[PDB]
């Protein structure tokens, strides 16, 4: 009984997931700009605002990560140049 009720719980939740998957696949396509051609002026206004926000954040992120990796490797340079003067001046 417990195995049979668990089995039908997972099949119910699997059905729910199949709905959300098709639904999110469509929503993603819309955000990727594949339905622009058939959209109303209102729908275009909406999507423009969302995509301008996305491109600002993505551009900004791309820059922050580059800066951070540069910042890391610059410190790693200092830290190694200091490690080499301790080793030399050891004697």
């Amino acid at each position: 009984s417990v195995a049979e009720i668990n089995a039908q719980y997972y099949q119910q939740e699997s059905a729910k997931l199949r709905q959300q998957i098709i639904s999110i696949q469509n929503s993603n396509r819309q955000l990727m700009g594949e339905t622009i051609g058939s959209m109303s002026p209102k729908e275009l206004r909406n999507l423009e605002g969302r995509l301008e926000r996305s491109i600002t954040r993505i551009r900004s992120k791309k820059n922050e990560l580059l800066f951070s990796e540069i910042d890391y490797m610059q410190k790693r340079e200092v830290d190694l140049h200091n490690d080499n003067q301790i080793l030399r001046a050891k004697i």
Binding site: N6, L17, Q25, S54, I58, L65
Partner: protein, 88 residues
């Protein structure tokens, strides 16, 4: 027991497929970008920039059509007015 286990494996696979699509969506909205490389971010940037050019061009075309339609009606309503003007 075997039907329960098969039912669970199905549910985990679908769960993982959905979580992956949720991560993809978050990125399309400009969120949870931590995992992505410079290259992946550039790729999104090119896609977004392309969609935005197309959106802007169509929004402007809808507004030109709307304006063209209003000029047309303005002409019709002005000759309708001058007709009533003379008739009265």
């Amino acid at each position: 027991l075997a039907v329960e286990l098969s039912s669970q494996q199905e549910y985990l696979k679908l769960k993982e497929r959905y979580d992956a699509l949720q991560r993809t969506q978050r990125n399309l909205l400009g969120e949870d970008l931590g995992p992505l490389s410079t290259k992946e971010l550039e790729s999104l940037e090119r896609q977004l920039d392309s969609s935005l050019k197309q959106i802007r061009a169509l929004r402007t075309q809808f507004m030109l059509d709307q304006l063209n339609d209003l000029q047309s009606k303005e002409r019709m309503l002005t000759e309708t007015n001058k007709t009533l003007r003379l008739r009265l």
